[PDB]
Design a protein around this ligand. Structure first.
Ligand SMILES: C[C@H](O)c1ccc([N+](=O)[O-])cc1
Ligand code: NA
Length: 330
């Protein structure tokens, strides 16, 4: 089997991407944020505290003939940005782009933090990191990908995120029309539950490539590119008037600037992030200070290849016995 679904940016900055997901019988379609840096499939629901729902579409298990309470199971997750949610668990039929899993754990939110409530466009998350990070207790649950894997034509999914445009998540096949050149594969460590890999270095604009190992994660549910302070300082030093602002919480730059590209290494290959992808617009409405898309990881504990990086590439998440990542230009 395979599946193929379009993923759409939630706003004009590509802050996140939503993908329609069918849950239950008859289908309830919710727009979920596919997150390769977490491992819970959780939804706004009929159980979510009413004051914490503002415009989201909810899953109602009582209207699904295939829903079944996973008795005793609870969940609680806290994300890198300080957001969180928690609740109880049902199993139900979940379909993505024509690929169906029966018995998928659907984590029903009883509580969500303010950032979720405030984002009317995201009805929940679909985690695509390793199932070792799944929060369900006392019996850990599998991700949609892990449950689908055995049925897929090939044990892979691919992320093809758009810049200010829709893109695609495919399951079970690699669309050879969706990228240019060849795919370069690189090793993955699953030790921390992530798609963790080591970039071979970077370049700023038309500058020389610096060969240096940068461990980090491929995380579709993080907007920006978080890299070591040395790397990030070297990038923003090439932008007149850029500075790190403790008041704003990262590097800002004049909105009048033209940004340089940023290249990262994948083995001997190179992925180039255009300068425009690193513009996250005014810090507040109407400001002439703009927020940078490359930020320091120094206060995270991990480097994160978020959407800024991943949407410059066709990315293969290879879930074979020995997982690997692949990157191609597009
Ligand atoms: C609501 C907030 O933007 C949000 C937080 C965390 C994730 N995630 O890591 O995928 C998505 C969305
Ligand atoms: Na922000």
């Amino acid at each position: 089997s395979t599946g193929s679904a379009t993923t759409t940016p939630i706003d004009s900055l590509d802050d996140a991407y939503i993908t329609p997901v069918q849950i239950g019988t008859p289908a309830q379609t919710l727009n979920l944020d596919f997150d390769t840096g977490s491992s819970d499939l959780w939804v706004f629901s009929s159980e979510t505290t009413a004051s914490e729902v503002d415009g989201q579409t909810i899953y109602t298990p009582s209207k699904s003939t295939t829903a079944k309470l996973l008795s005793g199971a609870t969940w609680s997750i806290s994300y890198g940005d300080g957001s969180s949610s928690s609740g109880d668990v049902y199993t139900d039929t979940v379909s993505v782009g024509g690929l169906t899993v029966t018995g998928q754990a659907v984590e029903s939110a009883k509580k969500v933090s303010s950032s979720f409530t405030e984002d009317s466009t995201i009805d929940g998350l679909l985690g695509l990191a390793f199932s070792t990070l799944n929060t369900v207790s006392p019996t850990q649950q599998k991700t949609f990908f892990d449950n689908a894997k055995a049925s897929l034509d090939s044990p892979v999914f691919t992320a093809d995120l758009g810049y200010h445009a829709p893109g695609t998540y495919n399951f079970g096949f690699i669309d050879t029309t969706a990228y240019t050149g060849s795919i370069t594969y690189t090793a993955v460590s699953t030790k921390q539950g992530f798609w963790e890999w080591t970039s071979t270095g970077y370049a700023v604009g038309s500058g020389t490539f610096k060969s240096t190992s940068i461990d980090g994660i491929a995380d579709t549910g993080t907007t920006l590119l978080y890299l070591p302070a040395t790397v990030v300082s070297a990038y923003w030093a090439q932008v007149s008037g850029a500075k790190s602002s403790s008041s704003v919480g990262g590097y800002v730059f004049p909105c009048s600037a033209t940004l340089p590209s940023f290249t990262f290494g994948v083995g001997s290959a190179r992925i180039v992030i255009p300068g425009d992808y690193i513009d996250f617009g005014p810090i507040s409405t109407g400001s002439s200070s703009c927020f940078g898309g490359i930020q320091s990881s120094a206060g995270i504990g991990i480097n994160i290849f978020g959407d800024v990086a991943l949407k410059a590439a066709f990315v293969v998440f290879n879930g074979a016995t020995t997982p690997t990542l692949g990157f191609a230009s597009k």
